Design a binder for these strands. Structure first.
Ligand SMILES: [Zn+2]
Ligand SMILES: [Zn+2]
Ligand SMILES: [Zn+2]
Lengths: 119, 183, 147, 92, 49, 65, 56, 56, 30
DNA sequence: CGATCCTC
RNA sequence: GAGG
């Protein structure tokens, strides 16, 4: 989605149609501000969600002593120093899939063989 | 170390799973009905929508949580200042009661003083963040059986409860004996 | 099952599909609301192929775009046309529905309403997901084939 | 001297504990079949070690000979009974 | 809040392990949740390790 | 609470053996097993009689009256 | 028996391997649950079975 | 338990007692058997109260 | 050697050390 | 409005 | 309060 607030107000910007020229704009309701929209996308729901699986990837991650280490090689660099975890998306219908964080380049790689991913 | 004053605050996410227009309202001690979250922030000092949301959402890239708060932004759209926000709760005198209720009753742990609100608003935001974090099915509902979240009251603590009570009645009796000494 | 013809694995798979209550929610990945004003010329470059058709054998400049999960559609005996013709037979005239073929790489449904517009389409999407019985009997949440 | 330290269930969440000092951390490269089955170190990212696993128990259970060779309810029942027993409660 | 909690947490533990912070005080660093939690309060059941 | 006279199980007198036993451990510096055997406590019913005896009378005597 | 114990031990090791493989399969996203149940629920049902089987 | 690493679905990790009461149970095994055991004592106490009422 | 690591038998000295200072009912007293 | 039997 |  990615939505903005008024440059001056810092108050939520609301959609507005040109009608004449047929184009997406965003108006402020606190003041007289108006700006063009970037993407036509106004609302995004998502019932089957991919976001929150990698939630918690912090540079200090390798220092968590409770997290397990795998014998896996990083696709990027060839570091075998890495930590791993299952989906942090604490939902019932979730993949048994693992996520590996290479402890030498921060690269996040997966055990998944079906799906690709762009994180 | 100062009395045993308990007041439970609830941050209630209205709207069922699959119900459109999911609003967030808070319970305040001695306040007849629920109050929309943005109205709490406004009554505290946080006025712009972006600043209110800045306190709840800790990452810009998280549109999911931001779309979750869009109806709250609408819920209190009619209120755009601390004066009318405090006024909502509850002459004139009704605003003072609300101002006092925010400092004395709302989050007494943290402070019961006056010059804070920033600490209170940020924490209220942390609370909502945690409420959404779960609601967004990213986090598991808090375990009320975790031992670490339980404390054991021993000899000292139990004696202290009684002693506080007993000494106060004694203190009160001295004052009644002082008051009776009109001559 | 029907005395017959009861020990046939196939007929069972059908009766399971005929009775298990299936909603639009159970088959949708995400629901988007784009500002697509030109009905003939789409702003989404993936959809371009879909738009070429649905012309032979006035609207709203706001598009409602649902992306369906192939797996779910195959767990249920569901096809795009089935879902599409079911969305059509709800609003009848107050909504225009176009859709992707079953063979097509992505499973997409495009909807348009037939002042104060942006609020209405968000209300319709809620009625679609939570209030549309695609197939199955209400209350029958799950059905299992057992020998 | 910081050789030992106090942990509560909350802090317990952030630490990795070895069960044995030796048997949980020497090194790696035949066995006694009579001896029980003890897994592997596997995790090595340790921050602490258990003083003695038998310390998971309290007064009553501490009296049982080999509860590690008993059904769990029998240890609970025995714990109830040792409080019905007779003997020198005090010298005075 | 704190930027470089790894440094903060190493000092905090050092002090408790030296004695300068009461041994019964609990310091819990949640790396992935960007959180530092401290408890000085009575009632907490603890055990030595 | 003093050396029981006689082994419960068998009857062999054990009341005359306590002090001799302590000396064998103290003076002679022997182990319990050789000491028990030196006193002629051959059966395990007799060995347990002395080996497991706890002499609380010493504690009881420590009380002032 | 020395021989018997040796055989019980190997019975348990094979349950440990079956449980590892189903896990490794699960983690590769190759495990596909049958109608009516979660991919996790099916994995769990399976693991518990191999283990119960091993005890018997 | 805090002796395990995060996300461990292994037999040993989730309450599989590999050992016989003869061989003896490990501390981890010991605790998990106690957890199972407790639940059994709790519903034993529940059954007796509930069934008694039913009978009446 | 003084730098050598501990065995599981060496645990009992630490346990003895514990109770020789705390006893069994410290929670009460403390 | 209910919530196993016994006596201390 | 303790017993099955
Ligand atoms: Zn503005
Ligand atoms: Zn790497
Ligand atoms: Zn004898």
């Amino acid at each position: 989605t990615t939505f903005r607030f008024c440059r001056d107000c810092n108050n939520m910007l609301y959609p507005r149609e040109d009608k004449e020229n047929n184009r997406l704009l965003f108006e402020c309701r606190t003041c007289s501000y108006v700006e063009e929209a970037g993407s036509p996308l106004v609302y995004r729901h998502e019932l089957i969600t991919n976001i929150g699986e990698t939630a918690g990837v912090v540079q200090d991650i390798g220092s968590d002593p409770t997290l397990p280490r795998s014998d896996r090689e990083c696709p990027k660099c060839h570091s075998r120093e890495n930590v791993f975890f299952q989906s942090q998306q604490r939902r019932k219908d979730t993949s048994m899939v693992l996520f590996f964080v290479c402890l030498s380049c921060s690269h996040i790689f997966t055990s998944d063989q079906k799906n690709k991913r762009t994180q | 170390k100062g009395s045993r004053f308990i007041s439970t605050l609830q941050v209630k996410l209205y709207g069922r799973e699959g119900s459109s227009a999911r609003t967030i309202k808070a319970t305040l001690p001695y306040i007849k009905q629920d109050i929309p979250i943005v109205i709490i922030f406004r009554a505290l000092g946080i006025i712009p929508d972006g600043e209110i949301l800045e306190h709840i959402c800790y990452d810009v890239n998280d549109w999911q949580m931001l779309e979750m708060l869009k109806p709250c932004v609408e819920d209190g759209f009619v209120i755009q200042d601390r004066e009318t926000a405090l006024d909502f709760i509850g002459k004139e005198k009704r605003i003072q009661y609300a101002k006092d209720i925010l400092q004395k009753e709302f989050l007494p742990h943290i402070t019961q003083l006056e010059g804070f609100e920033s600490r209170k608003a940020f924490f209220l935001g942390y609370m909502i963040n945690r409420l959404l974090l779960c609601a967004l099915d990213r986090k598991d509902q808090d375990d009320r059986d975790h031992f670490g979240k339980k404390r054991l009251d021993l000899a000292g603590p139990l004696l202290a409860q009684l002693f506080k009570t007993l000494f106060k009645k004694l203190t009160k009796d001295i004052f009644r004996y002082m008051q009776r000494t009109v001559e | 099952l029907e005395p017959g013809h009861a020990a046939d694995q196939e007929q069972a798979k059908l009766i399971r599909s005929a009775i298990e209550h299936t909603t639009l929610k159970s088959v949708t990945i995400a629901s988007e609301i784009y500002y697509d004003p030109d009905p003939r010329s789409t702003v989404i470059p993936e959809d371009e192929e879909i738009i070429q058709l649905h012309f032979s054998l006035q609207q709203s400049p706001w598009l409602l775009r649902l992306e369906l999960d192939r797996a779910a559609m195959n767990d249920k005996d569901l096809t795009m046309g089935q879902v599409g013709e079911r969305i059509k037979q709800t609003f009848k005239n107050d909504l225009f529905v176009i859709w992707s073929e079953d063979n097509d790489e992505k499973l997409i449904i495009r909807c348009r309403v037939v002042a104060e517009e942006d609020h209405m389409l968000k209300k319709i999407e809620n009625t679609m997901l939570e209030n549309i019985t695609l197939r199955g009997v209400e209350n029958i949440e799950r059905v299992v084939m057992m020998k | 001297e910081g050789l030992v330290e106090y942990i509560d269930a909350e802090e317990e969440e952030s630490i990795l504990i070895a069960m044995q000092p030796e048997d949980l951390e020497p090194a790696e490269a035949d066995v006694d079949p009579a001896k029980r089955i003890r897994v592997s170190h596997h995790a090595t990212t340790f921050t602490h070690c258990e003083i003695h696993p038998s310390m998971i128990l309290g007064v009553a259970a501490s009296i049982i000979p080999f509860p590690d060779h008993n059904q769990s309810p029998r240890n609970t029942y025995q714990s109830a009974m040792g409080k019905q027993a007779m003997g020198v409660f005090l010298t005075n | 809040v704190h930027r470089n909690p790894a440094r903060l947490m190493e000092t905090l533990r050092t002090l408790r392990r030296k004695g300068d912070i009461n041994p019964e005080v609990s310091m819990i660093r949640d790396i992935r949740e960007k959180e530092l939690k401290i408890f000085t309060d009575a009632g907490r059941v603890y055990r030595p390790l | 609470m003093i050396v029981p006279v006689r082994c419960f199980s068998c009857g062999k007198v054990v009341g005359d053996k306590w002090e001799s036993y302590l000396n064998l451990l103290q003076e002679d510096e022997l182990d319990e097993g050789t000491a028990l055997s030196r006193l002629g406590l051959k059966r395990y019913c007799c060995r347990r009689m002395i080996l497991t005896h706890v002499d609380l009378i010493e504690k009881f005597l420590r009380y002032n009256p | 028996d020395g021989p018997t114990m040796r055989e019980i031990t190997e019975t348990i090791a094979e349950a440990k391997k079956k449980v590892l493989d189903v896990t490794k399969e699960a983690q590769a996203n190759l495990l596909t649950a049958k109608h009516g149940m979660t991919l996790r629920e099916s994995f769990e049902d399976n693991v518990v079975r191999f283990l119960n089987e091993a005890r018997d | 338990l805090p002796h395990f690493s995060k996300d461990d679905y292994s037999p040993e990790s989730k309450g599989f007692v590999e050992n016989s009461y003869l061989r003896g149970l490990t501390p981890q095994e010991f605790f998990f058997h106690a957890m199972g055991g407790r639940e059994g004592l709790i519903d034993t106490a529940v059954k007796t109260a509930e069934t008694g009422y039913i009978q009446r | 050697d003084e730098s050598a690591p501990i065995t599981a038998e060496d645990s009992w000295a630490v346990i003895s050390a514990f109770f020789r200072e705390k006893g069994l009912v410290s929670q009460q007293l403390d």
